[model samples]
Target: SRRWFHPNITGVEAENLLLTRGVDGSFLARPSKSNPGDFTLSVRRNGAVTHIKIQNTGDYYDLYGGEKFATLAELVQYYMEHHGQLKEKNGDVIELKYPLNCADPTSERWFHGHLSGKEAEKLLTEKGKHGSFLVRESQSHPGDFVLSVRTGDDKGESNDGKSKVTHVMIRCQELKYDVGGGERFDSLTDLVEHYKKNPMVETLGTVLQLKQPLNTTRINAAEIESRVRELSKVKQGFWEEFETLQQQECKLLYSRKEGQRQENKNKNRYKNILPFDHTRVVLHDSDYINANIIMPEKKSYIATQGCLQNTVNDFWRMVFQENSRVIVMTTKEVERGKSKCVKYWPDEYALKEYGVMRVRNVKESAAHDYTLRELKLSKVGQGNTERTVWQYHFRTWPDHGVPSDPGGVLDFLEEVHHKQESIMDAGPVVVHCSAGIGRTGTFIVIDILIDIIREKGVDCDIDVPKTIQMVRSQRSGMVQTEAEYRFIYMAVQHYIETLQRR
Candidate 1:
């Protein structure tokens, strides 16, 4: 049998015991004093036999590997047990305590700090702290959970048997993540103070791991400024030429793509693809596009059925079009869930054919051509199916209406952001549907409202009316139906709420 030693274990002397391994891997040194120590040593040397001769200690408890526990009663018990050892002042002060971890598995290194039951209650009930279950896994989470106590109220209260107290101090032990976030304290007072003094995070909302749609829409100020500088360097003639070339090219490509569709024998094909011609199709994601281009000069008037032809259409849309560059993809296309638009890439022809692309529903596909960024709200639940005009958010295997899931929407939005960046070459990238209005309107409004809430940091409460007004302004009076309006309202609300949380 090979012998090994873990790390140092500490806590002995009365309520504490410590053990250690030798300089080289050898035997473990036990707490040579106590009866419990002998039993613990035996258990360590001999893996429990069927007739288990291990003796359990009344005041001792074993600490499982990678395990942690917190309870108000536990704190009180530990404190009362060692009350005599603690030096107390007659001042109007209260006790504070923190959570504990086992210093050793085999020795008496398992220990907790001190606090009264009342103190623990106040910390848990008043502070929203949950001392319920134990954390058993080794995986690290976002925040640290801490416990502590304070003496005498910090507020100046006389010690003359007055109802008020004078000084309050708190002690805290934290379980922190490697990323420097995810912390929970025993009391709100301690939590606030920790937040104030040692702000490991930029914002409080960021620590909660809550979804905030607002985060989805933030425009990096430095990036915006750099973009402004870059744009300023461009000649006006070139800008105008770019606009002109884009428009002319849009007309030409639309005419060609539409021409080819019109050339198709199926009449429904024309109805399906041609109606969106000259429509302002906005790509949900555009993270990889050139920053110089925001919205393209024109929307894609024509649509394509085959991925190959769509790539061609995407190219000219960037070279000749405006702000509408974006493509919505499905499980059949990119990685799982929702993502921005991008053509089939990886091979040489794909890069050339679909350079600077955006993809949608990334969660549904794999090995996207580019990274995604933003997404349109309406993209959720909107697909080619005629059964319902709605499309759900991105899905690993999307079935409409799953837009309610935060992960689904986030993944979808990420794809959109990715597309917004790369596909500026083709006016933006074009988004479309079998019929342009229903899904198109929903997606556009959703995207715009999400961006407004996220970028503007708009209040979540006011998003409904704001979205209503925005729809009317952008699309010559949009968001037509009551149900659709409700859907939009919910989507916008979700986005706003999610943003604030993030």
Candidate 2:
């Protein structure tokens, strides 16, 4: 239910919904609780949420200044479709990416419940080209089911110089799919299939067609089992979603020139897989490290490759500069046969110096799955600056694919977060694997999803493919496989089941 307009929710409710239900670039529109006809667009970014006022007088809608629209939906959708357009007095460009969709009336991808008329217009215009259309529940007695299609021949502009959107209502009565006075078919899809070939004429003598459908990726968490069952049977379902994710890889071409330099190339575990230059970590003097800061939600992490022998010094320098306290090593030194990562830490109760940083392994406790090491670090001769770093050396994670079960990894993450929460002003946790994109990506995605589930509860709505899409934008090749992707679903399913009994 992409309910773009929530009539009664105040600003505070908007904050909670966006923070609890959304990721960065997530947003929604609600009527002004105080001012009649006024609206507020609440958006979540980074870890904070923001609200921007929308002025809706008797005539038109505008965001204080900028393009004006005849309808509130057009205003929100306009900003949603266009980027770098909505900015505040402080010069912050507000992005409207994902709508905080409400509950849908139907689980069908074509049926987006509570999606406002203008919201459909935006989607049809942006995601849909010409005959693109979808169905949604109407705003009010207004109607039961509304048909929003990209129609008309007037250059997408109406008499008021606004975007043209064609909408028709589907009438249902007495719990029957009696759409439009008994002009019925088998079901909803049955009627849509008929309309797919035949073009209907509007009151304005315009042609309407359903050339394509703008499918939705949003899913109901409560029905995840059915979704999994259906997807599992489909065979190509997971592959198609994963394939779509890879298609967008070209858009994140932000450049990685720094990681490709001769001096910095060897520092990276893999030549082709390097950090995005824009998000790469920059040190004080030697600012070239093969690490990228990935901020998915509340927790931020630095994802880097396993250290090479010569680059061991640069790795500690990064930890020192960022003041990272929690280091998650998801790879064993040797996996299968080859070396995954070099052991970059000192022996137990021993001190080692790398460059100007001195790291001492204060204590090492080996657990069943992961070993927790308390490492003390400081600069040379700077005794007062010594800081304690908790390193969770995950021992059993294989170099390729995922573990047989997710419980151990989940338990490992619990201990990792325990240490992370205990530190004061702890820097981003440093996460690494052999290439830093596969297993590292899997761990970070699982943890972030768990964080979301824990914060909101097991009932929270989540998009696993979308979450992978989010992280991959920060670091490409996250959740690396169809099997790994399926493993994520399995883990979440198990987690939800655990929550049910508890």
Candidate 3:
């Protein structure tokens, strides 16, 4: 049965919950406080909240003087699917995209997503007693979430009239979490459960005294920082997962001997960076060029290094041979004080020959975070044949670090995928960064995991480390740094937040 109806909340409570947890087009049905038998619908729309009264008469429900339904669920569902039927007083369309999910009971409430320390303290102090506690997202540190608790009632009204509150920053460093911190747990559920039974004692001999939890049920979206905040309590945080992933890396023995071969050695931009022997893309009449096939989705793309001066020809050869219709360039020709990649494409209306292939830059333009270019790729003798190739050059992704917000990268990838998906029978899209294993790996990994969530609902299981491991098997050292690894979780959580709204 659907759980969209939230019973026993006043107009003010509904407004607060919907504003904090709902997105534009998100709505929830609740009983009216003014009238015991009537109902009210609260919705979040365009920076404001809306409440509609539904009179519940015998055998029918209606919006005062509008189309009626047999039940509340039927009425809500009708407007949600039927567009333009629901509108504001001034005739503005009131779209209902998704429902604000109800995580009833103690299943997901103890984790208050983004409550400030002050707010958390107030709640525990007024509504709780000794041993009562709640976990929250830390305000100072955006990523590291914390735990809040009340201390001392057994000592009998103790020193202060107000309750004592202890804020514990849940340390997520090595795949284990603790409070005092002991009994390292792999997830927040286990960590919280551990303390509830066996209270923690710190070095100063202060007991963690975790008891009754202050729960919250919020499943919302949009840039929805609240939704992002809610993610802080699910399982272990990113750092622990990344460290565990790093440990798993040592166990993998994917061979890169192909890039080490004398003929292909000079072709690699980095001496240590090599494409995996098995998934390495073999060029036409060429053996290697630091590239590997990642996944079948998004047109089964290839991940390779930004073209080095000497390997420029081989890079074009791989493109031509693979019949790639789109190229994603993540690094610039130069950076810091050196060239991360050579200038491989000719100027607009200009053409250049690389190996048996010839390329002409036909158009150039700038978009949100990337530079767009149209290139016509053809062979020397097959000049009569023309194939349009689009290149999305990401101008902001740093060579050494990752972006703080995944929003831009997510937007860029969507545009890239739109082009890739639009092309008919196109070969794998070509993605390249300086070494191709870092940002290239990061992009592919995020894209691969996103597809996983898109098809199988966001509630499905996803292992970032395992997915990264799978990519590493295809291309060595993907998602290169712990920073990048951490960002993958950040990006995925951000994506999950958006999905929750709809």
Candidate 4:
């Protein structure tokens, strides 16, 4: 064991190893003067020196980078493999080569932590077929990998008569395994294993199936209010329930004043609470808010709180990270002498830098009660690769009240829905309000219910209680009060009436 711990290397071999990785001899390899049985390989990056020592044993050399390894050849190979991919202390990537390829042996080791194209291909074909799949480097974050299943055929050719190629969507980052609960896996292997089972296949099947819109069925506002009254009777202790959702080490509450007044003057007895179980947007210092999925759609929407001054950059980071195309802000910037939300979006012709992301307002338009703006977002090192993010700000929605009429809100929803549908290739729609629970929840519920009605038919004995329960199961205190619950039915009724008239 002692002999195998370290090995001697000639000066020529050490020089060749450095040459292979194209690294200059800024830091040299020399014998340790103090320790007779050891050698040190010094490294210099970003004007700082870090020394990795090799302890001499008879047969091998023990190498240390922050950890230990055996053999001089092994240590050299490992360092050369990961040399360029390693970042500097100030979070800048040490650019080794441009346009790195996965198929090349030299660059293949750069993707050690990630699943290679061949690895994904092998996984897909293990079921006795050369299955269809697409593996590509992420556009948003270069060097990060993204793999997708082909839309139809084994050779990745579309089965449809048009022969259009498409991909079966998979959200690897979220790692969400189940729709009913916020169950997730740690790594790609765990995620793949979970989906490999028959039960999970069925779940994916259900989610993948296209839902048809329901036939119009008219119902009045009074009947909707009656249903809300019934729903209110079932334990409305949301204020107390919210206390249970403080799972993160750092407190997520921004502006304790708004948080304390969540009940909204007895109109809503239960505070709009974020469920403990909802998916969290993990930040550098803290977990901000509950960003949950409204199933059977996986990347449906990220329900989150409106941005605070400190969280504006974090919000942009989440947007860029998730590749989200649409953002729905369901509250005004300022309402009743209170700052409901920070001006997260850029103003006309103004450029705002949020962390590494720079956002510019390219265009803005006022439409009825809501304002729409197109934001151009680009990261620092991503060259000219920029993404257009659509921001919908609903201006008329009062702080502690509902819209004066449902027509304006309904029109806004239609526009938002159309935009979302147009981008079949985009990420989830981010919806937020002040606390991210009241109006935010209400808006998501309305959209979800509308889709459900379209698919299952409005006449099909709509289960209002169960529908809200499903939403609440994902995010607590969604449809925060009896008043908000009543608003949902009224909105649906108005929507149906408008459709029938058309």
lDDT of 4: 0.51
lDDT of 4 by residue, 163-267 (tens): 222223334445332223345554333433344342223344532111111111123332544544443451222221121121110122222123224332221
Q: What TM-score goes with each of the models?
A: 0.29, 0.61, 0.54, 0.46
TM-score of 1: 0.29
Candidate 1, 1-502: lDDT as tens digits: 0011112332232122211321111122222233322122211112211111112111112221111101112222323344312222333212222212222212110101222434433432332221110111111222222222222222222334322111122232453222223664443333433543553322433222111101011223223333334424612221221222111111112221332243332322122122223343333442111111112123222222223333333433332334343554322333325222334433321222234332232222333232332321112233331110111223242333223443454446555655454544433334333222334445555565566555556432233333444333322223323334445545654555555567
Q: How do the candidates rank by lDDT, highest first?
A: 2, 3, 4, 1
On lDDT, the stronger of 1 and 3 is 3
lDDT string for model 3 (1-502, tens) is 2346654357887778778877788888776778655678778899788888886432125575245443454455457664338876787777777687543312233665556877777677656677878887667876556888777674223456544777788876565566544477666767776777877777887787776664222122233344335344534333334433543444445566776688877887765466768888876566677888987424587988788788888888888788789999887788766567888999989998887889999999998688999999988997575798999998887544578789888888878888988888899889887667767888888887777767776556565666777777777667755567667767877887777766
- Judge candidate 2 at residue 154 and give its lDDT: 35
TM-score top scorer: 2
RMSD (Å) of each candidate, 1 decimal: 26.3, 20.2, 22.7, 24.0
**Pairing residues by index, what is the TM-score of model 3?**
0.54
Rank by TM-score (best first)? 2, 3, 4, 1
lDDT of each: 0.29, 0.72, 0.69, 0.51
lDDT leader: 2
Q: Please report how far candidate 3 places residue 176 from its true position, in Å.
A: 20
